[PDB]
Design a protein around this ligand. Structure first.
Ligand SMILES: Nc1ccn([C@H]2C[C@H](O)[C@@H](COP(=O)(O)OP(=O)(O)OP(=O)(O)O)O2)c(=O)n1
Ligand SMILES: Nc1ccn([C@H]2C[C@H](O)[C@@H](COP(=O)(O)OP(=O)(O)OP(=O)(O)O)O2)c(=O)n1
Ligand SMILES: Nc1ccn([C@H]2C[C@H](O)[C@@H](COP(=O)(O)OP(=O)(O)OP(=O)(O)O)O2)c(=O)n1
Ligand SMILES: Nc1ccn([C@H]2C[C@H](O)[C@@H](COP(=O)(O)OP(=O)(O)OP(=O)(O)O)O2)c(=O)n1
Ligand SMILES: [Mg+2]
Ligand SMILES: [Mg+2]
Lengths: 534, 534
């Protein structure tokens, strides 16, 4: 919404920031950006200010040790309701100190300890008031306290989303314990109910569920009942999306399932000075997306594609992207942890820096990821006349490997969500080449490696075609399948998940999600849920 | 804190806004502002954007009817914990759509109904689980639920204060019912405990308590026990401040005690089209403060004060202030309720406007107040050689009466908090006249009609000297008394309150509030609590 005060103030800061970037970013980078050769994301935040992008918040480390929120020294919560309330408070803090999404990974595992304190208190209350059914009481009341907790989290998020922007992601699914199972059902059931009187579909927090054999994949795993609720939820509210724990670990090289930071940014395995695999508290430093159809367009001589020209534009644009990413990483030199206490001093990034410490040292040596985005492989294939998707991407990775070796920053290939960039690249390519059949004519570029829409493909076929890209674009990727109402056909939906889980990493399903308020109309046309009526 | 991201972004919007104001405010107003003749407050928000200033939120009307928060249709809360959580969510909404303080008046009365729903549920739970002590159970658990509710509100406020700014005020004291009494003690007890591990003193929400004979003034009123807790609270955390219900109603002309909007802005009695006295949902449109010592300084000829010159500067500066206030009120013409749905469409301003309705119509005919501020009566008295405080103010009111009759807006005389303006006026007057003994030498002007500090005056004397100004500056006023540690002398403190309550409207007491964390050092040097170490 643009007429709203919070949005107007933000555009003012954004205008000042785009102006400042103009005086800080080397001219050749800004022109390539203005012309649509590449896209420097979030130029309205960075580099005017030394913001970072998305992250996995180290909530576990914050709740167990304490942490300062303002001047107040917060202590380990003593109940589930107070721990999700604190989670919501951390969410508000983190959202205003980075410009990308914030993720709370494995809330079933992390919050589990507070469901137990809540249970214990209801047992201590079963005797103190001489309650007959002591165990079934502590069970009932605890159930209700976890439910209430996640209902309150959802409304907290909903308010932030309207008093500011805030993309937050909640992941779970690997926990088996009874506490962990209760959190999962609590999250899934609040979602199914929806928001407010008319139980509408919320756009955040995004929900992502880990599915794994032995946990909740097959009819006989401990949590198959949850997968069933999860399926009902997805049919009614689109989320959760799912991640195949199996493929996810092979891609990331990580011992435990890696939750995306924001929409789909994936970290790669990393160890601290002592051999420990750290996930939570890590972040991403920014995205610079390469316009791939445009490298191909700029390679035409007359109406003919020139292969040797392409190779030169590709190589030179790769160095250009590198230069763009480094420009912003350099904007972080000399910035102090005073810039964002919640992130650098109080534990959200998993370490404890002193006011006067430089924040950049924390991101070095593979700890933070750095993103080289891309878009439009479908349109690129068309302009070059054959399918070079897997090939061009594999080559980008080899460049990325050298960048990583030269600088120590962990560059990875990222499948840009490009909710708007999909229009912006197409429109700037069009000002130069006009309507190009099958490329710029439709008005937008297809996202990353997705098979274009307008392609009568079955779900399994689409999944089978996209799956290899998940093992290539390691920094971020997702696959979508369009499906009709699956509310009375949960086995259908499950069939697709099962296939997805087996072949790829991160997956979600787009179906219509509406209600005759006698209305609530949601669609995932690009990356987020939205009312297509707007 | 300035190095922090949220603050930096805000300064950017503020810079753009001061620039825009320069192209919208008539030149003669901006110069008078630049030179320190007057002070247009919040120029970093308005008029660049059609923001209003402070308000009493119509929480009662929002909780009982429903209201939309984003797209979610919120319903009457079913528990005390959920109603204060919603209150906190409304607080975040309101703070980001106005630039001044937000007040929740009489939370003891307004929230009372949810303490009863919470009680009922614990009774329905006393039987369902066969509980012996049914009544003492519902009593214990409810007590704890109200306590938990207000503890959660306080931390919510604390987070907002650090992820943005937000001045929020909570008033109570007139409720006698058991539910109302429980809310009051719940608010007072959480405050006494303080925030976090080290139980530090919070700077918000400000707490103000109505004191009244028959309610809680005398040793035998129903709520004298609360006044006693309130006194202990004030000795330990400065708040609450108090308002003499008695004087307050005579000044405002209102049947019920009028809570200040923000720090000390007071509405005057007003009726809707149907004869009803509306308080909640009303607001203030802005403050323009008149530099009084400066009118006197600019009246000196050589080292001598010229009375006839003063009269001319006073008259012309009064018209100037009027012009300044009207300039901004005019900036609101044509602004639609789409600008702030929570405020205009969903009930916070107590009415329900349609997207396409003009917001200005809501403020007309005395509904919103409009502020003419002033400062430095102590320094003015010195420069003119006699005490003309009550006189100059009374004259300002006569001008205000005509302004109100000419425009329909309810202009009132306002005792500007001037946390910074006290330095800014003095420093600009100094660039012109230099060090002036007893006036600009010390570096700041005394607030409104306060007796300057540096004056060995007893508390009752100070109270007796300031009290008449509360019946004059009807738009906003307060009186402070400095006192040493009164923790082991609550009768002393009570003596002062009692005297204050009898003679004036709004009162608070400044004492030292510290803790050897073996530190937390708070002082109210100007208008808010603060760590004088900064
Ligand atoms: N919305 C809230 C409520 C509490 N806290 C903080 C204050 C303490 O440092 C820590 C402890 O929380 P509690 O679990 O103790 O909350 P209660 O005091 O309400 O429950 P109890 O009296 O059972 O401890 O959490 C917080 O950050 N945010
Ligand atoms: N053509 C564009 C591109 C961006 N933006 C705005 C919207 C966002 O608030 C901000 C973020 O811009 P990005 O530069 O990151 O572009 P995207 O939002 O499309 O990409 P993604 O969804 O991958 O973040 O800029 C815009 O209005 N128009
Ligand atoms: N932090 C929260 C929690 C709930 N609500 C909203 C959703 C409903 O429209 C209205 C009703 O709240 P409830 O009192 O029903 O909250 P619960 O569902 O947790 O309790 P219960 O199941 O007893 O109704 O409040 C909200 O705005 N903010
Ligand atoms: N000399 C001044 C005056 C104001 N401001 C800034 C601080 C506030 O965020 C914003 C509000 O300014 P006002 O113009 O309203 O001045 P005050 O804050 O002193 O007055 P009051 O406490 O009555 O709001 O401008 C400032 O830095 N220096
Ligand atoms: Mg506690
Ligand atoms: Mg409910």
């Amino acid at each position: 919404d643009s007429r709203v005060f919070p949005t107007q103030r933000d555009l003012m800061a954004g205008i000042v920031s785009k102006h400042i970037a103009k005086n800080m970013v080397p001219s050749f980078i800004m022109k390539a950006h203005e012309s649509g050769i590449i896209h420097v994301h979030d130029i309205d935040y960075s580099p005017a200010l030394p913001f970072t992008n998305c992250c996995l918040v180290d909530l576990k480390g914050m709740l167990e040790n304490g942490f300062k929120l303002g001047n107040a020294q917060i202590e380990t919560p003593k109940s589930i309701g107070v721990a999700t309330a604190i989670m919501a408070q951390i969410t508000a803090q983190v959202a205003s100190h980075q410009y990308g999404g914030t993720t709370f990974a494995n809330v079933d595992k992390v919050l589990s300890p507070y469901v137990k304190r809540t249970y214990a208190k209801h047992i201590e209350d079963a005797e103190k008031w001489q309650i007959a059914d002591a165990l079934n009481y502590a069970q009932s009341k605890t159930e209700k306290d976890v439910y209430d907790a996640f209902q309150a989290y959802e409304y907290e998020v909903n308010t932030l989303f309207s008093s500011n922007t805030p993309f937050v992601t909640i992941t779970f699914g690997t926990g088996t314990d009874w506490t962990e199972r209760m959190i999962q059902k609590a999250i899934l059931k609040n979602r199914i109910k929806g928001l407010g009187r008319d139980g509408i579909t919320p756009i955040f927090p995004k929900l992502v569920m880990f599915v794994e054999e032995g946990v909740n994949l097959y009819k006989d795993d401990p949590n198959y009942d949850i997968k069933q609720l999860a399926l009902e939820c997805a049919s009614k509210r689109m989320y959760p999306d799912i991640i195949s724990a199996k493929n996810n670990k092979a891609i990331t090289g990580s011992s435990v399932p890696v939750s995306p930071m924001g929409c789909r940014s994936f970290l790669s395995v990393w160890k601290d000075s002592t051999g420990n695999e750290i996930l939570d508290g890590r972040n991403n430093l920014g995205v610079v997306t390469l316009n791939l159809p445009r490298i191909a367009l700029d390679s035409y001589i007359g109406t003919q594609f020139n292969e040797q020209k392409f190779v030169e534009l590709f190589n030179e644009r790769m160095d250009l992207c590198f230069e763009a990413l480094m420009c912003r990483i350099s904007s972080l030199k000399g910035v102090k942890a005073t810039v964002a206490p919640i992130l650098y001093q109080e534990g959200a990034f998993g370490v404890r820096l002193k006011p006067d410490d430089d924040i950049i040292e924390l991101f070095k040596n593979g700890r933070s990821s750095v993103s080289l985005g891309y878009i439009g492989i479908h349109e690129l294939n068309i302009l070059v006349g054959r399918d070079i998707g897997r090939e061009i991407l594999t080559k980008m990775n080899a460049h990325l490997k050298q960048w990583t070796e030269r600088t120590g920053f962990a560059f990875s290939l990222y499948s840009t969500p490009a909710e708007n960039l999909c229009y912006r690249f197409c429109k700037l390519d069009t000002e130069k080449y006009g309507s190009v059949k099958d490329v710029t004519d439709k008005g937008w570029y297809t996202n990353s490696f997705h098979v274009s829409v307008e392609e009568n493909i079955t779900p399994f076929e689409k999944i089978s075609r996209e799956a290899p890209y998940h093992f290539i674009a390691t920094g971020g990727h997702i696959s979508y399948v369009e499906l009709p109402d699956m509310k009375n056909n949960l086995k259908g939906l499950e069939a697709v998940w099962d296939y997805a889980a087996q072949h790829l990493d991160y997956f979600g399903v787009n179906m219509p999600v509406d209600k005759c308020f006698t209305m609530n109309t949601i669609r995932r046309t690009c990356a987020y849920l939205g009312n297509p009526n707007e």
